[model samples]
Target: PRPLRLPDGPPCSQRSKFLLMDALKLSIEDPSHEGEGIPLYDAIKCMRTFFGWKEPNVVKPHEKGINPNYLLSWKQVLAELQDIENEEKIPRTKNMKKTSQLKWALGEELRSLASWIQNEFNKACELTDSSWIELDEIGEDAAPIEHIASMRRNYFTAEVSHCRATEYIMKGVYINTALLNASCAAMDDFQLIPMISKCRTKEGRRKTNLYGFIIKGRSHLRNDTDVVNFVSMEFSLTDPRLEPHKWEKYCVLEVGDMLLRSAIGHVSRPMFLYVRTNGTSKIKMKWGMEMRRCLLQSLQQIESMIEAESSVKEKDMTKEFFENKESPKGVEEGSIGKVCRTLLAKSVFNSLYASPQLEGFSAESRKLLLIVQALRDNLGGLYEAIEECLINDPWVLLNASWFNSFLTH
Candidate 1:
C-alpha cells in the first residue's frame, strides 16, 4: 500500500491562527483598530447558529464557516443522534444515551435563548426606531458627528452587503421599524396564511426547508409588534431529517437566490429603512424591495398549500424533548464544569470582551453579547463533553491536515 490518506482542509492548528486574527478584528475594525463595533461576520455567524441557519456542507474543505471553533455543530450532531434508521448505526459508536442526555438538557434552554435573542433584536429595532425618529425631527439627513462615518457609509441602506446590514442593526441608528414590524407581523401571524413549511411551489411540492414546522412559542415582549407569536423552531432537525438540511441550504442561498443572505432577513435581525409608511418613493428597505417582496410573495403563496399534511405522519419523537418546568436529570455529570471552562477559554468568546471601550455599543448589545456567548458556551461545553465520553463525533471525519500532504516529499 502507498501512504495513508486523510480528508482535506487546513490543519486545525494553522486555521486557528487565522480565526484568531478574524476574532480580533470583530471587536474593532482592522488597519486602525477603530471602534466600528462588532463586524457583520461575527454577528451574522452568531445569528446563523442560533436560528439553525447553518450546516456541515462546505464548498471546500478549507471553508471558513465549518468547525465553528469546535469539532462539530449542535444541529448536525443532534441530527445524527436522531437518526436511528441509518445502516451505519452500530459502527458509529455506542454512547447514544449519554450523548442525547446533552440534547434533552439543552433543548428548551436553547429554545428560550433563541427567544431572548429575537426579543433583543426586536428591542434593537425599537431602540433604533426611536433614535431614527429623533433624526427625522432634525430634517431627514441629520446624525451625530460621531456617527458621521456610518451615516455616510450608509451601512443600513439596502444597497450594501447583508453583513453590513447587521452592522446597521447593532449600530442603533436609522432603522425602519414599520417595515421591520411588517415582516414580523407576516412571519408570526401567518394564521391568515399557512406556515412557511406548508408553502408549496407551483409544482405542488413544498419547499419543506423553507420552514421548521415544529414550533415553540415565545413569551410576551415589550415591543408587542406582532409579539403574540415568537418561536423556537428549527428548519433542520435530526432523525426525521429534512428540516436541518433545508435550513443550511437557505443559509447559503437565502430566499433561493445566490446572493448570500442571513437570518437578518429571515429570522433575527430585521434590517431596512422606511419613511412613515409613506408612498414607495419615501421608503427604502434594508435587504431591498425585491427581497421584501419575495418574502411577501412567499407568504401570499402559503394560502395555496390548503391541505394540511396528515397528522399520523407528523408525530415527531416528542419524548426526545423535555419540558422547561419538568426539570432535567443527568445534568450533573463531568460535562458541567468541563463545558463551562471550555467556553470561557475560547478566544472568540473572550475577544468579545476585549472591546471594552463600551461607549460605542448599545446596552442591549452588551447584554446580548454575553447571552449569545453563553449559548455557544453551553453548546461547546456539551459538544466537547460528549467527545470526552469517547463517543465518535465529527472529529472522526475532520481532516484539519486533510490537504497538507499534497506536496510530495
Candidate 2:
C-alpha cells in the first residue's frame, strides 16, 4: 500500500511527526526495502534544514531530542488546522456582508436623492410657467406661452422617466463596482468593464437598454484610442421586464460591444427646437452651440469639485505617513471613490447629450438644462456623501489594506 504523503508547510503537527517517526523506523529496520521504505531520515533532515529547524536530529528516538513545541498530538494538530481555516474564513465572510450592507445603504440614500431631485424639478417647471404667464401679458407672441408650456411638459415627462431610470442605473453601478473591486483583489492583471441593464418604454413597446461602464485602462480598443469599445454583459430576463423592481435573477446572455464614440455621435447631435421660430439654420446652430457650451461648463465645474474632494483625501492619507518620512502604502492619488464618480458622470453626460434640442433660448430648454445641472450636482454629491460615510468603515479601509497586502506579498 502507498504511504500517506504529508504536507511540507508549517505549523508542525503530531500527524506529521508520527508519520516521520514511522517512516524513519521502517527505513532503519529495512534499508534494502525498495518500494515501501524511503530514505526517511534524509527527507526529514532536508525538510528541517529547508524550514530552518535548529534541532540537529528531529527524528531521534530520545524524547528531549525533538523540540517540545514541535511535538503535537493528533487532536492538537486537528484543532490548530481548524482554527487556521476559520481565521481565513472569518475575514471573507465579514467582507461579503460589509459590501452588501454598504450597497444597500448607498442605494437607499440615492433613492431619497432621486425623489428630492424630482420634486425640485417640478418646482422649477412651476416657476417657469409663472414667468411665461407674465411674458404673455406683456406682448402678443412674446414668449409663445402655450407652445413653450406644452413643450416643457413633454420634456419634463421625459426627464422624469430618465430620472427614474438613473436611480436603478446607480444601484447597478454600485453592484458592478463592488464586483470589479473583488476581481481586482483576486487577480493581478484584472480588467473589467461592468454593465447595467434598464427597462424603458420605447414608442409603445417596452425595451431593455444596456449600458457599459467604461473606465480608464479599460476604455479604448487595442491600438485605437478614438474608437472606444463599450462591452456589456447581456442577460435574459425571466419576463419581458419593464420596471427595475421586476428585473431580478437574469440568465446571462452573450456579451455585447458597442462603438462608444460612434454611439455618442449618433445620439449626441442637437435635437429639434420644437418651438416655431423665424430664423436661419445658422442661427439655430448658434443657439445649439450656446446651450451645449453652458452644459459642458456646468459638467466641468462638477468634475472639478469631485476631483478636489478626492485630492483632499489623497493628501490626508499621505499625511498619515509623512511624519515617519516613509511613503504610504496603497495610497492611490485622485482615486478615492473614483469609480462612483466616473459612472455617475458618464450617466449624466449621456443624458445631456441625448436631450431634445430647443430651437432657441426659451423657458423649456433652460428648464431642461436646470434639471440636467441638478442631476450632475446631486450625483457628484451622492458619491462624496457615500465616501464620507465609508471613510472609517471597515468595508472601505480594511478591504483596501487587505488588497494592497495581498498584492505586495
Candidate 3:
C-alpha cells in the first residue's frame, strides 16, 4: 500500500483560489508572523504539542513522539529556569550573618524569596495557558485547526514543566537554607555546645553535630516527608485546590486506592513520564490530552475577553497632554513639581548608575548602582511605554500631591 495522503489546500475554482490567495496575503501582511518560520498550519500543531494536546484519536503509543513546536525547546526552557533558581543562592550567602540574627534574617529572606519564586513560577505557568488560548482562538478565527492545536500543546507543556521544576528546586533551596540557618543558630548558643561536642567523631575525625542531628533529624525529616508526601500525593491526583477532576471523582473516592492512581496524580507525578510503564503510560496519554485541552480552552476564552476589552476606544488623557504643545504651567524651581521631577530623576539615575555625573561618585563604590544600570537598560523599552502614557496625560494635579505626600512619608 502507498503512504497515506494528508489533507490538501483550500478548495479550487477561480473565486476560491482568489479567496485563498487573499487569505495567504493577509497572513503575510500580519507583522506578528514576519520572522516566525513554519506556515500557520504547522505552527498550530507545534503549539498544541508544546502545551500538550491529546485527543482519543490522536494518542501516540510512544511518549517520545509527543514533542511540540514552539520558540524555546524543552531543554532550553528547563536550563533557563534552573539558572534562575540557582541564582538565589548567591544573595543568600552574601548577606548571611553569624548567629541567631542570621537565622531571623534568613527566615525573613527565605519567606520573601520563596513567595517571589512561587509567584513568578505561577505567573509563567499561567501565561502558557494564556498563550495557548490566544493562539487557538486566533487559529479558529482564520487559521486551520491543525495549526492551532499544535501550538497550544507545545506552549502549555513546556511552560508548565518549566514552572514546576523551578518551583521544586526553589523550595528545596528554601528548606535547605532554613535548616542551615537553624544549625548556625544552634552553634552560636553555648548551651548547645555540649550537645554538639557529645556527637562522636566519624572516620574523618570531623567534630560535626550533623551526624547526631541526622539521627534525630531523620525522624523529624521522616515526619516531614510523610506530610509532604501526603500533600504532594494528594496534589498529584487532585488539583492544587484538592478537588478531584469529575472523571477522577470515583477513583479518588475508592477507599484504599492510592491517590497516585488519580488523573491529576499522573500529571503531577515526578519522573512518571520518564520511568514506569503499566498504568502511567495509559493515564499519561489520557490526562495529558485532557489537561492540555482544558487549559487551552480556558486561555482562549480569556484572550477573547481581552480582545473585546482592548477594542473599545477609551480616552487616554496621557495622549492629550503631548498633543497640546503646552509649557509646564506653574512649574518653578524647587516647586513641588520641580522637587517631584528631581526625585524622579534621582530614581531614574539610581537605576542607571548615572550617580557619577550627579554626585561625582566613583564606579568602585557603586556596585548596586552598576547593577541597577543593567536592570534599567533591560527595562528601557517598558520605561518608554510608561513615558508615553504619562506625558500625554500628565495628571499633574494628582501626581504633584501624591509625590509630595510620598516624599514626606
- Of the candidates numbered 2 and 3, which has the greater TM-score value? 2
Clashing residue pairs in candidate 2, if any?
A: 271-357, 273-358, 273-359
Better of 1 and 2 by TM-score: 1
lDDT per residue for candidate 1 within 1-409, as digits (tens), equals: 1122232332212101011110101111121222212222222222333332333332212123222211222343335434523543222121222233232322320010112222222322221111111111111235453443233223122111122112222221112232233344433221111011111223433221112211112212334222232111222111112222211211211111112246566433211100000111112223322222221232223212211211233532122211111224533323322222222222112221222212222232334346555765686443232222221111221211111232122
Per-residue CA lDDT of candidate 3, range 362-399, in tens?
Answer: 22214333544576569644323222222111121113
Error of 3 at 375 (Å): 44
- Each model's lDDT comes to 0.23, 0.25, 0.23
Off by more than 4 A, model 3: 1-284, 311-409
Query: Tens digit of lDDT per residue, candidate 2, span 1-409?
Result: 1111112222111110001000100002212323321222222222222221121211212122222222221122224333534563322211111122122211211111112222222322221110111111111234545653343323223322333223332323333343334333532211222222223333333222222221112222223112221111122211212222211111112111222246346432111000000111222222322322322343344345444544776633222221222233432423322322233333333332221211121233234345556765697442233223222211122222333343343
Task: Give candidate 3's error at residue 78 in angstroms.
Answer: 24
The candidate maximizing TM-score is 1
Which scores better on lDDT, 1 or 2? 2
